[PDB]
A paper describes a structure:
[name] is involved in eukaryotic DNA-damage recognition and activates the Fanconi anemia (FA) pathway through complex formation. [name] is one of the [name]-associating components and contains a histone-fold DNA-binding domain. The [name]-associated histone-fold protein ([name]) 1/2 complex (also known as [name]/[name]) associates with the conserved region of [name] immediately after the helicase domain to form a [name]–[name] complex. [name] stabilizes [name] and promotes its DNA-binding activity.
Unexpectedly, structure determination revealed that one of the crystals contained the [name]–[name] complex but that the other two contained the [name] complex without [name]. It contained one [name]–[name] heteropentamer in the asymmetric unit, with [name] asymmetrically bound to the [name] heterotetramer. We could model most of [name] and [name] except for the N-terminal 13 residues. [name] interacts with [name] through an extensive surface area of more than 5000 Å2. The interaction is formed by hydrogen bonding, salt bridges and hydrophobic interactions. Mapping of [name] hydrophobicity indicates that the interface is more hydrophobic than the other regions. In the current chicken [name]–[name] crystal structure, the corresponding cysteine residue (Cys759) does not coordinate an ion. On the other hand, Cys670, Cys679 and Cys779 are exposed to solvent; in particular, Cys670 is in the disordered region and may be sensitive to oxidation.
Residue numbers in the entry:
A (entry chain B): 8 to 82
B (entry chain D): 9 to 82
C (entry chain C): 12 to 103
D (entry chain A): 7 to 102
E (entry chain E): 673 to 804
The structure:
Amino acid sequence: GGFRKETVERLLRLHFRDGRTRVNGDALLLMAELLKVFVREAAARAARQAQAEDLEKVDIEHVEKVLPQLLLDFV
Amino acid sequence: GFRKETVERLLRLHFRDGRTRVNGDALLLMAELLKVFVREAAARAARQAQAEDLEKVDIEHVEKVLPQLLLDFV
Amino acid sequence: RELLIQRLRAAVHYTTGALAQDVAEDKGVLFSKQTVAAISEITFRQAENFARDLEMFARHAKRSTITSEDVKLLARRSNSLLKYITQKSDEL
Amino acid sequence: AGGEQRELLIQRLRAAVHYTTGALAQDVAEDKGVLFSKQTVAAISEITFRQAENFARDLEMFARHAKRSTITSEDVKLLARRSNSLLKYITQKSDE
Amino acid sequence: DPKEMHCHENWSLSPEEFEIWDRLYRLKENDGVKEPILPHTRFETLENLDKTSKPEEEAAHKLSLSEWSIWQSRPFPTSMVDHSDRCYHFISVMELIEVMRQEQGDCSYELELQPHLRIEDIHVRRNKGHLS
């Protein structure tokens, strides 16, 4: 799998503005899958950009190229 | 800046459902939000032109500012 | 219809030029006609994004009428944008 | 966590996100036959960390908007409402 | 009795996972590469609730969202998450800007809209003449 449920809850409560805010188990498991989808999307887009430039190593420029459109799909 | 009635036309133009309506307070807030968005775009593009020591703002400065601009307002 | 869209675009274009003129005289710069036309198109497209989110935000709170709290929800990501508008909402 | 002495928790969560990003990137590398640079994995980890901050703020404001203190499946659906593939997958997995 | 998944039921890394992250992914003093950092949000027209807690943010590589503007006129494929209307609107303006960079689409945009300008829609202002 990917992220553990406890890591997602710790990461979300780090940025929660209020202390009374809580997350249900189903929503916590949904966010762990959503983060895994985001990581795979970024890595796959950067890797296919390296493939389109015929490069077997994904560097920082391939992440920078796909990044603007990538962030705009997850806003 | 933007008039309240035109903002109501701009929002109604893109509503997917017919029962959706907008309150007067939200229309006045949206007119302010749109004015801030335009002024933010112009101020950021001008600051890029100033960084290049250019008192004339071209579309090259819009490209430098557009991605972060859309990501800051959501 | 397309005529209504062009009518709203022309209004956004003129308003964008007027606001860019205020920013231009604050910094002593000149805006190109290409620059204001680009910013006007961004503003027009941003109105669709705002309208679509507000409608879905209203349905999230079991409402068909968009209120001021939905406009506040648009600025939920930036604190500086959140504290603004909220203070403008309280003062209206 | 708030305004003082929370950098250690941030570094620990950063390292955890970095490890998970590297583990997922290795599977993507197996699937596409490429190799990811160290700096590339660190960049994707930083993007993921800030996107997690955006997600947490969005979920909390969506829950508070519906007069709720608990973030539920409706908040995640409203977060993924924007993309067809991201929204229907949630409906595929949130119900399941 | 599972010693591997025993040490990680928690939120942080297990001691076995910290070893993997340290050797393989952690950018160290040995790594002659700069740390990747995303730029912060900063408004020119609003009071900035300052996120300036890191004055070290230039011993690193700031990920630029605008260095590859020329590539942004067309969609950048997709693995599993399709592009959004927010993204398509951004691509359209970039395509518009590149059409205007060739002198063409810039003056015509103002031209095609001026017959549609209903004065009752706008807040009339004085043409200060700071448009070139």
